[PDB]
C-alpha cells in the first residue's frame, strides 16, 4: 500500500515507502560508520600553500568560509564543498601545518581575531606590526630543524553568534571570515633550498552545524 | 635515584592525517585552554551530525515527457540506478543541477542501500492513461533497448494510473547484487569487466496510450525524484561528478 | 518604572479624580487593539502573474521578505519604525488559482541569506511546499529565526534574513483557448515578535 | 483567529522547521517592546517661558 | 626484560606561549625546589586577583560646562558609550589622563556589560535648573545632531534637578545590541560597516534654563564619571588608546 | 530609586545603582574567564632581546620593575603596563627564553640575587667573575643544538618584604630590582650566522599583588 | 595495536645544577645497582646533618 502517496502534502511525506517484498539487510560489517560528520570531516583536509622568496618576510592568510573567493585564494576541494552544505558554523577548529625544505629556520605563528588591525590578507610583505603587539595576542615559536610540523587548535573568538558560508556583498565581506593565521620567518638567510609551507584544516568535536542548505552545483567546486 | 626509561619506537614524528584521533591538536592558542559550551539559541534547534539529513530528502533527478503520439510498448526513458544520476541543467547562470543524494555520494567510493524513486505526474483530472516502471537487475552496460513490452512484465514492475488525487508513486528498488558493495568508477577513466556502478537499469514504458479531449494539452510531463534509505558508505575522496546525459 | 525616569527632590503626590470605569454597554465589541492583534496579522507582499512563456526553472517572483514588510503601508510599520532591533519568526502563504483544464506546478522555497550558488534541483532541501493544479492551491511555510547576529537591524541591515524564491517546477501548458495565466499572491506575518531599542532617530 | 480570515476548500498543513529557541545568553537585556512600554511612556508637550 | 615504547608525536619541541599551562617552568633555580608561603603582613589584607577591583571604581571621563545663555533644547555635550572614552588632558607634565575602566579594556578585544555614568553637579544651593540625559541606542557613526528636544523624550531618558543635597546621578545604560559582543576597532585603521565599538550615543540637553541671582556665578560645571558592572572580556592584546577629542 | 545618590558620601557609594528596568543577562558562553589576573598574565609576555657579536662574551640584564627606565632597557609593552597597576609584588616568576640562529653553542645561565657582586647591568663584556663563583649560585648549562629554548622558574630571594614598581630617586635604585639573569656563551667561534636571544616573562600561581594603583597615562606606555 | 604518544616539551636535554633533584644520577657504575647501609661504628656516634 505504501507505493502510492501525495508528496504535495507534507504530512504524508513522512510515510515509510514500501514497494516490493524485502528482508532486513543484516548489519554493516565494519564497526565505525563513515557517515557521521565528526568522522568524515574528522579526517583533515587541504587548505592552502605558500612559499617564501626572501628572508624576514611575513605572510598572512585569513580563513574565509565565503563561497565567492575562488582558489588559489579561498577554500579548495573538500572544505569549499563542506562548508557550503550548512548555513552556520561555530566552535573551534584544529589546524595542522607542515614545513618542508630548508632547515634551521626559526618562525613565530600567531592568531588574529576578525576585525582587529592586521596585515593585509593574501599578501607577502615585511611585517608592519610592533613586536610587542604580536606576542600579546599569543603565539607559538617553532624551529624547523626539530619538528617541521605543528598541530594547534584555533579558538573561537568572534563578536558574531556564528559564521556563515553563503552570503552576498556587504555581509560576505565581514561575517564570512573566521580569523587570521600568520607566520613570520627569521634566519632564512640563504635564498636557496626553497622553504615552503602547507596547511590542513580539520573539524573538532566541539563544533556545531545548523540548518542544512543545498549542495553546490558542479561548476562551483574547484581545485588548485 | 631517578630511573625512567622509554625506547623511542619506529615512525618517529610522522604526521598522520588519516583519522581524527591523529588530527587532534596537541596545543592551543585559546587563552587558559578554555572550552566552549553548546549554544542552540539562534539555530532553531536544528543540529546536523549525520548526512542522513540530506539523503533522506527527495530531489529532482530528471524530467521526461509523455506524449499521446507514442504507441503502446514504446520506451519513454531509461534510467540507470545509482545515486550518481542527474541529467538536469540550467542556462542562467550556466550550471549543472546536482541532486542531494548525488552530492553526498560523489565524495565516497562505495555504497549500498535502496534508491527510492518518486514519480510525480502533472496531469489534469481529464487525462487518463497508465505507465509501467520495469526494473531490470544487472549492470549498466547491458543492452536494454531490445526488450519488448510483453517481455518486461516478467521483471518486477508497478503499473500506475495518471488520474486521481494521488499524483506521486514511491517505487523502492530492492538491493540486488552479486557483491555487497558497488563502487564509484567515474573517477577512473575506462571500463572494466566486473567493476560496476549501477545495480541495474530502470525502464518506463507506455502501457496505455494517452487520451484527452481537444481543449487540453495532449502531453503530460512527469518529474522523477530520487532519495535513499538504509544507505551505507565508506572510503571518502574528492570528485566532481559530471552530468550524465543522453 | 518604564523608561522615562524622573529624579526629583521636591516632588509631591498626584491628584486623581474618579477612576477607571468598566462599560456596562460597550461601544465597540472587538478586542482592544494591542501588539498581538497588530504585528501578527497577515499582510500582502508580492502579486505577480504566472504565464506559459516562463521556461523551466525560470524565476517568477524573487522576494526579500523583511525588506518588503517594512513600509508605510502596513500597520506593522507602527512598531518597527520606532524600534532599532528585532528578532522573530516568519510564516508564509502562497495562493494561486488554477483552472483544472491547466497543468503544471511551482515551488516556494524559503532560503536564508541568499541562494548564492547551490543547485536549483535541490530546493526541496530547504523548507518548501509544492503547488500543483491537481492537488492544492495553497501552501503554509513557517520558519524560525536564522541569522549571523543576535537581532535584525532595520535602518541599515547587514544582509536580508529570509529571501524567498519561487521557481517554475514544471512548464505551464494549456489547450486551445483556455485562459493562459493565473494570479499569484504571497502573504506573510511576523511571529512571536520581540522588540528592543527605542529611538527617535528614525525621524 | 485574529482578523484576516482565510476561507478555503483545498488547504493543507504547514511545514515547520525547528521551533522557538530561548536565549542562554541574551543580546539585549531590556524588556521586549510592547504596547505598555510604548504608548504609556512620558512624552513632552509644550515648552514656554514665564516672564 | 625491558619493554617500554612511546611514539614521539608531531609538534616536537614547540614553545607555546598561548596559555599559562604551556608557560609553566619545567625546572627551577630555587635551591631544593622550595616553595613560598603567602605573606599578608605588610599589604593591609588587600590582595588583587581580579580586574573588577579597577573597573568597579568610578573615574573622571569628561567635564562639560552648563551655561545660562543656552536656550531650551540645545545639546550641551554628546558622548559615545564605550569604556574607551576619555577626553581629559593635562599640561604639566604633558599627559593624557586615562580612566581606569579604559585602561582595563584597552588591552582587550571584546567586551559587554553596562557602562554606568555618574553625573556630578557642583552648584550652589541657589541655582535651579534641570537636564535631560537621552540615550540613543545604535552605533557611534550615526548622525545625532539633527535631533530636537521633543523627539528625544521618546528614547529612554532621566530628568535631573540641580538643587538639593543629592549632587550625583547614577545612570545605567542597559546593554542593547544586535551582537552579543562589541569590538575594539581603534587598533585597525579605517571604518567598516557592521563592526562597531560603542553601543550608541548619549546626549545631554538643557531642559530648563539656568537661573541665578546676580552675586553668584551663572554657569555650573558638571563632571562625568564612568564605570561598569557585569563586565566581561576576552582575547587580550596590547594597544595604546588615544584620547578621543572633539 | 537607585538613580540618585551622593558620591561625596562613601557609605552610599556602595549602593547598587539601578536606572531602567532590566533582565539578568544570562551567562557567559565560554567556560574560562579572561579577567582573572592569573589567567591574563598567565599568558607569557615580551621582555627583552640581545645579540652577541663575538665569542666568549657574557651578557647580563636585571629584571627591574621601575617605571623610570625606558625601553629598549626596561620593561616594554604589557609588563610595563601590568607592574604599574599595583603597588607591591612578591613571589616567584616563570622565565622562558628562546634561542635562534647559529648552532652547536654551549651556554650557561645563572641567577644572581639583588645587591651581590655581579656584572654591570645592560653591558655586554667579557665575564669578570671567577668560574668557581658562578656555579655556586646555581646555573643551568644548555646547548643550542638540542633545545634552543628554556623555561625556568626564577626564585624569590630578597631581603625586602616585597618589591614595588612606583618609586623615585634613592629608593627606586634599590628596592625596584627583582634580580639579575645572565647568560654566557662559549664555542661561538664563527662570527657569522648571527646568534640571538629573546626572553619572555610570565607570572606564577604563587605570586601575589597588593594595593591597586592608578593606571599609566598614555604617554608612559612604550614599545621597542 | 600499539598506541603510545608523548609530545616532547620545551627545554629538551638541559642540565640543571640548581637543586639536588636535578643533580641525582640516572645511571650507576655500582655493580648490580647495590645500596650502602649506614655504618656508625668508627665514627663515635657523631653524625652531622646540619
The best one-word shape of chain A is elongated
| Binned strand content of chain C | 35-45%
Morphology of chain C = elongated
Number of domains of chain A: 1
Could you tell me the CATH topology label of chain C.
Jelly Rolls
Distance between the termini of chain C: 26 Å
Task: Please describe the topology of this protein.
This is part of a larger assembly, with two copies of chain A (224 residues), three copies of chain B and two copies of chain C.
Chain A: E1 4-5, H1 37-40, E2 45-51, E3 58-64, H2 77-82, E4 86-90, E5 93-100, E6 106-112, E7 123-125, H3 131-136, E8 139-143, E9 149-154, E10 163-164, E11 177-186, E12 196-203, E13 208-212
Antiparallel strand pairs in A: 2-12, 3-7, 3-11, 4-10, 4-13, 5-9, 5-12, 6-8, 6-11
Chain B: E1 7-8, H1 20-23, E2 27-28, H2 52-55, E3 59-64, E4 77-80, H3 100-105, E5 108-121, E6 130-137, E7 157-161, E8 168-172, E9 182-183, E10 200-206, E11 222-236
Antiparallel strand pairs in B: 3-11, 4-10, 5-8, 5-9, 5-11, 6-7, 6-10
Chain C: E1 5-6, H1 35-38, E2 43-51, E3 59-62, H2 65-69, H3 77-81, E4 83-96, E5 103-112, E6 128-132, E7 138-143, E8 152-153, E9 162-173, E10 181-198
Antiparallel strand pairs in C: 2-10, 3-9, 4-7, 4-8, 4-10, 5-6, 5-9
Amino acid at each position: 500500500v505504501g507505493a502510492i502517496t501525495t508528496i504535495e502534502d507534507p504530512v504524508l511525506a513522512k510515510k515509510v515507502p514500501e514497494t516490493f517484498p524485502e528482508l532486513k539487510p543484516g548489519e554493516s560489517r565494519h564497526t565505525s560508520d563513515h557517515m557521521s560528520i565528526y568522522k568524515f570531516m574528522g579526517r583533515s583536509h587541504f587548505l592552502c600553500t605558500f612559499t617564501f622568496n626572501s628572508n624576514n618576510k611575513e605572510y598572512t592568510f585569513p580563513i574565509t568560509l565565503s563561497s565567492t573567493s575562488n582558489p588559489p585564494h579561498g577554500l579548495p576541494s573538500t572544505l569549499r564543498w563542506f562548508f557550503n552544505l550548512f548555513q552556520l558554523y561555530r566552535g573551534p577548529l584544529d589546524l595542522t601545518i607542515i614545513i618542508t625544505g630548508a632547515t634551521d629556520v626559526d618562525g613565530m605563528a600567531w592568531f588574529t581575531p576578525v576585525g582587529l588591525a592586521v596585515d593585509t590578507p593574501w599578501v607577502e610583505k615585511e611585517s608592519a606590526l610592533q613586536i610587542d603587539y604580536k606576542t600579546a595576542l599569543g603565539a607559538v615559536r617553532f624551529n624547523t630543524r626539530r619538528t617541521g610540523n605543528i598541530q594547534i587548535r584555533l579558538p573561537w573568538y568572534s563578536y558574531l553568534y556564528a559564521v556563515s558560508g553563503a552570503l552576498d556583498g556587504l555581509g560576505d565581506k565581514t561575517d564570512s571570515t573566521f580569523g587570521l593565521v600568520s607566520i613570520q620567518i627569521a634566519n632564512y638567510n640563504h635564498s636557496d633550498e626553497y622553504l615552503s609551507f602547507s596547511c590542513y584544516l580539520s573539524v573538532t568535536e566541539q563544533s556545531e552545524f545548523y540548518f542544512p542548505r543545498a549542495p553546490l552545483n558542479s561548476n562551483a567546486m574547484l581545485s588548485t | 635515584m631517578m630511573r625512567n626509561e622509554t625506547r623511542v619506537s619506529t615512525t618517529e614524528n610522522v604526521v598522520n592525517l588519516s583519522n581524527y584521533e591523529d588530527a587532534r591538536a596537541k596545543m592551543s592558542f585559546a587563552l587558559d585552554q578554555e572550552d566552549w559550551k553548546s549554544d542552540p539559541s539562534q539555530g532553531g534547534g536544528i543540529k546536523i551530525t549525520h548526512f542522513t539529513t540530506w539523503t533522506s530528502i527527495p530531489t529532482l533527478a530528471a524530467q521526461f515527457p509523455f506524449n499521446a503520439s507514442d504507441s503502446v510498448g514504446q520506451q519513454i526513458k531509461v534510467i540507470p540506478v545509482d545515486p550518481y544520476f542527474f541529467q538536469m541543467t540550467n542556462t542562467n547562470p550556466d550550471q549543472k543541477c546536482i541532486t542531494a543524494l548525488a552530492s553526498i555520494c560523489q565524495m565516497f567510493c562505495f555504497w549500498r542501500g535502496d534508491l527510492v524513486f518518486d514519480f510525480q505526474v502533472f496531469p489534469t483530472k481529464y487525462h487518463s492513461g497508465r505507465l509501467l516502471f520495469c526494473f531490470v537487475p544487472g549492470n549498466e552496460l547491458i543492452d536494454v533497448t531490445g526488450i519488448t513490452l510483453k517481455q518486461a512484465t516478467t521483471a518486477p514492475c508497478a503499473v500506475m494510473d495518471i488520474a486521481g488525487v494521488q499524483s506521486t508513486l514511491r517505487f523502492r528498488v530492492p538491493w540486488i547484487s552479486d557483491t555487497p558493495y558497488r563502487v564509484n568508477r567515474y573517477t577512473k577513466e575506462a571500463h572494466q569487466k566486473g567493476e560496476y556502478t549501477a545495480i541495474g537499469k530502470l525502464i518506463v514504458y507506455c502501457y496505455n496510450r494517452l487520451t484527452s479531449p481537444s481543449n487540453v494539452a495532449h502531453h503530460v510531463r512527469v518529474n522523477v525524484y530520487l532519495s535513499a534509505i538504509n544507505l551505507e558508505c565508506f572510503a571518502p575522496l574528492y570528485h566532481a561528478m559530471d552530468v550524465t546525459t543522453q | 518604572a518604564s523608561y522615562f525616569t524622573s529624579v526629583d527632590q521636591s516632588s509631591v503626590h498626584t491628584a486623581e479624580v474618579g477612576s477607571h470605569q468598566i462599560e456596562p454597554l460597550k461601544t465597540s465589541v472587538d478586542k482592544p487593539g494591542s501588539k498581538k492583534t497588530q504585528g501578527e496579522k497577515f499582510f500582502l507582499i508580492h502579486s505577480a502573474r504566472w504565464l506559459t512563456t516562463h521556461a523551466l526553472f525560470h524565476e517568477v517572483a524573487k522576494l526579500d521578505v523583511v525588506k518588503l514588510l517594512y513600509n508605510e503601508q502596513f500597520a506593522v510599520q507602527g512598531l518597527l519604525r520606532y524600534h532599532t532591533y528585532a528578532r522573530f519568526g516568519i510564516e508564509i502563504q502562497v495562493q494561486i488559482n488554477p483552472t483544472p483544464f491547466q497543468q503544471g506546478g511551482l515551488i516556494c522555497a524559503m532560503v536564508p541569506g541568499d541562494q548564492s550558488y547551490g543547485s536549483i534541483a535541490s530546493l526541496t532541501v530547504y523548507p518548501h511546499g509544492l503547488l500543483n493544479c491537481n492537488i492544492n492551491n495553497v501552501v503554509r511555510i513557517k520558519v524560525p529565526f536564522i541569522y549571523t547576529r543576535g537581532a535584525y537591524h532595520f535602518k541599515d541591515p547587514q544582509y536580508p534574513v529570509w529571501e524567498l524564491t519561487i521557481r517554475v517546477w514544471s512548464e505551464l501548458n494549456i489547450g486551445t483557448g483556455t485562459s493562459a495565466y493565473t494570479s499569484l499572491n504571497v502573504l506573510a506575518r511576523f511571529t512571536d515578535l520581540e522588540l528592543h531599542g527605542l529611538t527617535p532617530l528614525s525621524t
